[PDB]
Design a protein around this ligand. Structure first.
Ligand code: 5IB
Ligand code: K
Ligand code: K
Ligand code: ZN
Length: 399
């Protein structure tokens, strides 16, 4: 079955942040308005037996002192008094400032995403679900002891850690507009978790990594050498060119790695209508949405898959995309046609989809060959280092 993470308190917490507001409510209510919820298995967020057990789970990646600081930041923001100078310095030492500010629910908000993605991994591990969706997760920038890019706790790293510890190999695919640096870093030294981010990169663009570093392309270290893959793309790319750019890479990674699990971050900020206005992807499902192309390809592998959210700052259009991803996942996994009306159905958030109230977003639509050569060589290097068996020419012919 296809699972999806939600719940009443989960929804409230996922809607409690200043940056993402009620986006999660729009997403889930649009899925509900399209009558998809009866087709999906509800996966409840993980809850713990004690504070100690919760800390044990979160500090499988994050440092104790960072988790302590994140909890204190929440406590301080539930009081009226300003922070002391010492507490400002403490928060600064963990980058709990600027684009990762405090707010009254910052710890509960960030922990909720972890609860959802851990429960999603568990539902895959016990084979209750073949795919699980968590549109409240995907916070790929958070580091062991540092908040980054409004990511406070890295739910992805923790879910992947649960999957590998369940030989197990995980393929991580990051479709967000931004480089998946936190996940890449967490598994930099591990050959068992292969990470692949496609993203925009350019001078001064956040977070700065996932591209040439004379410049060299770093790709992992130690026994994780060659295990971190990146495809940086110039601005303006459309559905077809993005699809042709990542399609052969995805198929090649699946053939060589033969993953036990796939984890996909599906940040919606590549949409042409995202306020970043960098890429020109759509949610169209006949030009075919690059997102839907990638998800369909990944699901064709019949590997247990975790699908996560991430960025996406046009909330109605993020809901438009992720509703289409959710329907596609049902169709591909269950073989059951999901007919989705081109008009937004009436529901509590209907007014957010004006003026036209349609499901399609409102949009009128060499370098990559060099990257393909580089990535194919890295994959050969990864397979050689890890003594993996594979037909080099069947993979080469994909490109
Ligand atoms: C450092 O920035 C990021 C780092 C990481 C990510 C990300 O998605 N990671 O995967 C995103 C940004 N910046 C923005 O989200 C942003 C970008 C443009 C406009 C807005 C933005 O937020 C807004 C909130 C309210 C109103 C407007 C906006
Ligand atoms: K990405
Ligand atoms: K790795
Ligand atoms: Zn992003």
């Amino acid at each position: 079955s296809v699972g999806i993470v939600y719940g009443d308190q989960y929804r409230q917490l996922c809607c409690s942040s200043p940056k993402f507001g009620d986006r999660y409510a729009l997403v889930m209510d649009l899925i509900n308005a399209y009558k998809l919820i009866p087709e999906l298995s509800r996966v409840p967020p993980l809850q713990w037996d004690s504070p100690s057990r919760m800390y044990e789970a979160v500090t499988a990646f994050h440092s104790t002192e960072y988790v302590d600081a994140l909890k204190k930041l929440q406590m301080l923001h539930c009081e009226e008094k300003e922070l002391t100078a010492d507490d400002e310095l403490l928060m600064d030492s963990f980058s709990l400032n600027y684009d990762c500010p405090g707010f009254p629910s910052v710890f509960d908000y960030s922990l909720a995403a972890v609860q959802g993605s851990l429960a999603a991994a568990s539902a895959l591990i016990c084979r209750h679900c073949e795919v699980v969706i968590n549109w409240g997760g995907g916070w790929h920038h958070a580091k062991r002891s540092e908040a980054s890019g409004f990511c406070y706790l890295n739910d992805i790293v923790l879910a992947i850690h649960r999957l590998v510890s369940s030989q197990t190999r995980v393929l991580y695919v990051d479709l967000d507009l931004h480089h998946g640096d936190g996940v890449e870093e967490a598994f930099w030294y591990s050959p068992r978790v292969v990470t692949f981010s496609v993203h925009h990169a350019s001078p001064g663009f956040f977070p700065g990594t996932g591209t040439w570093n004379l410049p060299i392309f770093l790709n992992g270290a130690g026994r994780g050498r060659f295990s971190a893959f990146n495809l940086p793309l110039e601005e303006g790319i459309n559905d077809l060119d993005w699809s042709n750019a990542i399609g052969p890479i995805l198929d090649s990674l699946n053939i060589v790695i033969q993953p036990s699990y796939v984890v996909v971050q599906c940040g919606a900020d590549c949409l042409a209508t995202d306020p970043h206005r960098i890429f020109r992807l759509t949610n169209f499902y006949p030009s075919l949405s690059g997102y839907l192309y990638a998800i369909k390809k990944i699901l064709s592998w019949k590997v247990p898959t975790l699908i996560l959210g991430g960025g996406g700052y046009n909330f109605p259009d993020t809901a438009r995309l992720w509703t289409r991803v959710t329907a596609l996942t049902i169709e591909e996994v269950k073989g059951k046609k999901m007919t989705i009306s081109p008009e937004i159905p009436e529901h509590s958030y209907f007014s957010r989809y004006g003026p036209d109230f349609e499901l399609d977003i409102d949009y009128f639509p060499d370098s990559i060959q060099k990257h393909h050569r580089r990535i194919l060589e890295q994959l050969r290097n990864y397979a050689d280092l890890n003594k993996l068996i594979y037909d080099y020419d069947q993979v080469y012919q994909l490109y």
